[PDB]
Amino acid sequence: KDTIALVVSTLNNPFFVSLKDGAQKEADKLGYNLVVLDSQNNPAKELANVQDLTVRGTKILLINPTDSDAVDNAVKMANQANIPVITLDRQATKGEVVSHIASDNVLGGKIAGDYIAKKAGEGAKVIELQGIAGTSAARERGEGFQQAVAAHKFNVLASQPADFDRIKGLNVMQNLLTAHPDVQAVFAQNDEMALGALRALQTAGKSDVMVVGFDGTPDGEKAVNDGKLAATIAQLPDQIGAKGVETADKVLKGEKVQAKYPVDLKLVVKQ
Numbered sequence: 344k345d346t347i348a349l350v351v352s353t354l355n356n357p358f359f360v361s362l363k364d365g366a367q368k369e370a371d372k373l374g375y376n377l378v379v380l381d382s383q384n385n386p387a388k389e390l391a392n393v394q395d396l397t398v399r400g401t402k403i404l405l406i407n408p409t410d411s412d413a414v415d416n417a418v419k420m421a422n423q424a425n426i427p428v429i430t431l432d433r434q435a436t437k438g439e440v441v442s443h444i445a446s447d448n449v450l451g452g453k454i455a456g457d458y459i460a461k462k463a464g465e466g467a468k469v470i471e472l473q474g475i476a477g478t479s480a481a482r483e484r485g486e487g488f489q490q491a492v493a494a495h496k497f498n499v500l501a502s503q504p505a506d507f508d509r510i511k512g513l514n515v516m517q518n519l520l521t522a523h524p525d526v527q528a529v530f531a532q533n534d535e536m537a538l539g540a541l542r543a544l545q546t547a548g549k550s551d552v553m554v555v556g557f558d559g560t561p562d563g564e565k566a567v568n569d570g571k572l573a574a575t576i577a578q579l580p581d582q583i584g585a586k587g588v589e590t591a592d593k594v595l596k597g598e599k600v601q602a603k604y605p606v607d608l609k610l611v612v613k614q
């Protein structure tokens with residue numbers, strides 16, 4: 344059994360657990376051995392993970408960068424060891440990558456901003472909780488969101504990173520609420536931060552604020568159905584992991600693949 348390795352940015356996020364299960368289920372199906380390594384949002388740890396795999400008989404490296412610019416060293420190391428690299432969910436700015444599989448994050452941010460304008464109205468006062476700064480996902484969602492801003496003349500009271508983390512998303516929202524109690528809507532770049540923000544508005548008695556997340560995880564989807572979360576942009580993590588293993592199979596077979604494989608997004612609301 345050829346071994347395929349999956350280096351995921353973190354496992355302390357439901358989105359990445361689903362991504363891992365999708366890859367795992369497809370690996371079982373195609374008869375591969377899947378090794379899963381966790382970088383814990385640490386580029387130094389990612390590098391150590393990749394260096395350890397290049398001598399384990401790893402045939403293909405599926406990688407979710409902790410940082411789109413910093414991952415280039417790990418990619419170049421996989422290149423040196425003649426191990427083809429496929430990026431999942433986030434890009435590698437440089438380094439030789441056979442294929443990239445991800446959602447259209449620029450579209451995702453605009454759609455998020457457009458839904459806010461539809462509910463909170465044009466010229467609405469918003470706060471944006473951003474993801475991990477150096478990743479392509481956060482960067483692109485912000486750009487897409489900046490398009491809805493200009494178009495809907497939104498007044499952005501504040502925009503700040505909460506690192507795709509639920510607890511950080513809670514503390515950052517907590518701190519911003521004290522300074523900006525007039526907030527009407529919040530765009531949270533993932534469901535974890537969106538759920539943290541919700542808890543902050545809860546602790547503050549500020550139930551009037553409209554929160555839009557991203558991912559459509561089990562928790563994110565439930566909060567929308569319970570009426571707490573206004574909407575989330577559903578991604579298909581399991582299919583990104585599966586498509587990644589599927590593509591790793593073709594490369595090993597000698598079949599050429601596309602340099603990019605998009606995955607569908609879907610606005611999620613109650614009913």
Ligand SMILES: O[C@@H]1[C@H](O)[C@H](O)CO[C@H]1O
Pocket residue numbers: 356358359432433474478480481507532533534557558
């Ligand atoms: O797309 C992924 C998911 O949104 C995850 O929740 C955080 O990292 C992003 O890159």
